[PDB]
Amino acid sequence: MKIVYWSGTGNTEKMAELIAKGIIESGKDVNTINVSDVNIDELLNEDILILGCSAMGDEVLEESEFEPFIEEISTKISGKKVALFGSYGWGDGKWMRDFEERMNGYGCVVVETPLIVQNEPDEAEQDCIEFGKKIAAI
Ligand SMILES: Cc1cc2nc3c(=O)[nH]c(=O)nc-3n(C[C@H](O)[C@H](O)[C@H](O)COP(=O)(O)O)c2cc1C
Numbered sequence: 001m002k003i004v005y006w007s008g009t010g011n012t013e014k015m016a017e018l019i020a021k022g023i024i025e026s027g028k029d030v031n032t033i034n035v036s037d038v039n040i041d042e043l044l045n046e047d048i049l050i051l052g053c054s055a056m057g058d059e060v061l062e063e064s065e066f067e068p069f070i071e072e073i074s075t076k077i078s079g080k081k082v083a084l085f086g087s088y089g090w091g092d093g094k095w096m097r098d099f100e101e102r103m104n105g106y107g108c109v110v111v112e113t114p115l116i117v118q119n120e121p122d123e124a125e126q127d128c129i130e131f132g133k134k135i136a137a138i
Pocket of ligand 1: 006007008009010011012013053054055056057058059060087088089090091092093095118119120
């Protein structure tokens, strides 16, 4: 499996690593990929796209890198299962509610409730691992 993410301070990166840990504990292989290094063709071969990005701008996806990536794959993912996650700060998930609506609008099947954690995981570390386990159980 693959996990593609954007992280500005490492909070979403930590989430990505914990989600990976959960998938691995479930017995499956998974690679975590920073959005700057993503191979689009290889990502599209996956049965489940696990995508993560923190809340940026005013409740939007990161603009220089993550956003363009979503735009590029947008027309090539109808029917694909996707799992979404990200870290946030002062809000309550607006950017993620929009991210979920967006992917649904592209015809994706959002497999689990998006995982959102405030700042660095910490107490929420297990929540990250468990989200990975849910994805692996599909
Ligand atoms: C310029 C900027 C904009 C942000 N916009 C939001 C926002 O609209 N809502 C929110 O809850 N947090 C927002 N945050 C907070 C980040 O989402 C939060 O610090 C998160 O833990 C960052 O994760 P990361 O290290 O993976 O980037 C913003 C942070 C920055 C740097």
